[PDB]
Amino acid sequence: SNLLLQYGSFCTQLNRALTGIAVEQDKNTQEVFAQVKQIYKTPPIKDFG
Amino acid sequence: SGWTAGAAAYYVGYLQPRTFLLKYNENGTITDAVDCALDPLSETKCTLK
Ligand SMILES: *[C@@H]1O[C@H](CO)[C@@H](O)[C@H](O)[C@H]1NC(C)=O
């Protein structure tokens, strides 16, 4: 670990890239599924013709 | 027995191998520091530099 201490910039940029990927995944799910802001419910009756 | 002690105090602590993040100001003086791996917030401050 003491020898690795001088590669902190490399490891920081690695973890920055991975954190960006993770935030991107959360954002992707949000854009696909959370388009509608309101949670509509199905009617109790199913008279859909 | 024929003596008295003047008022003074001293404090003793022990050093450990630690990683520190030191801040050198514009005049070259260490004005502040972060003891790394004290608490998780300090680890975050280390990683973010
Ligand atoms: C640095 O030295 C100069 C003296 O020329 C002084 O004016 C200044 O306050 C010093 N900077 C700090 C942060 O103490």
UniProtKB/Swiss-Prot annotation, chain A:
Function according to Swiss-Prot or TrEMBL: Precursor of the fusion protein processed in the biosynthesis of the S protein and the formation of virus particle. Mediates fusion of the virion and cellular membranes by functioning as a class I viral fusion protein. Contains two viral fusion peptides that are unmasked after cleavage. The S2/S2' cleavage occurs during virus entry at the cell membrane by host TMPRSS2 or during endocytosis by host CSTL.
Protein name as it appears in the record: Spike protein S2
Organism lineage: Viruses, Riboviria, Orthornavirae, Pisuviricota, Pisoniviricetes
Full-protein interval shown: 750 to 798 of 1273
Swiss-Prot record, chain B:
Function per UniProt: Attaches the virion to the cell membrane by interacting with host receptor, initiating the infection. The major receptor is host ACE2. When S2/S2' has been cleaved, binding to the receptor triggers direct fusion at the cell membrane. When S2/S2' has not been cleaved, binding to the receptor results in internalization of the virus by endocytosis using host TFRC and GRM2 and leading to fusion of the virion membrane with the host endosomal membrane. Alternatively, may use NRP1/NRP2 and integrin as entry receptors.
Disulfide bonds: 36-46
Quaternary assembly: Binds to host ACE2. RBD also interacts with the N-linked glycan on 'Asn-90' of ACE2. Cleavage of S generates a polybasic C-terminal sequence on S1 that binds to host Neuropilin-1 (NRP1) and Neuropilin-2 (NRP2) receptors. Interacts with host integrin alpha-5/beta-1 (ITGA5:ITGB1) and with ACE2 in complex with integrin alpha-5/beta-1 (ITGA5:ITGB1). May interact via cytoplasmic c-terminus with M protein. May interact (via N-terminus) with host bilirubin and biliverdin, thereby preventing antibody binding to the SARS-CoV-2 spike NTD via an allosteric mechanism.
Domain of life: Viruses
Protein name, entry field: Spike protein S1
Region Putative superantigen, residue ranges: 25-46
From-to range in the entire protein, with total length: 256 to 304 of 1273
Glycan-modified residues: 27
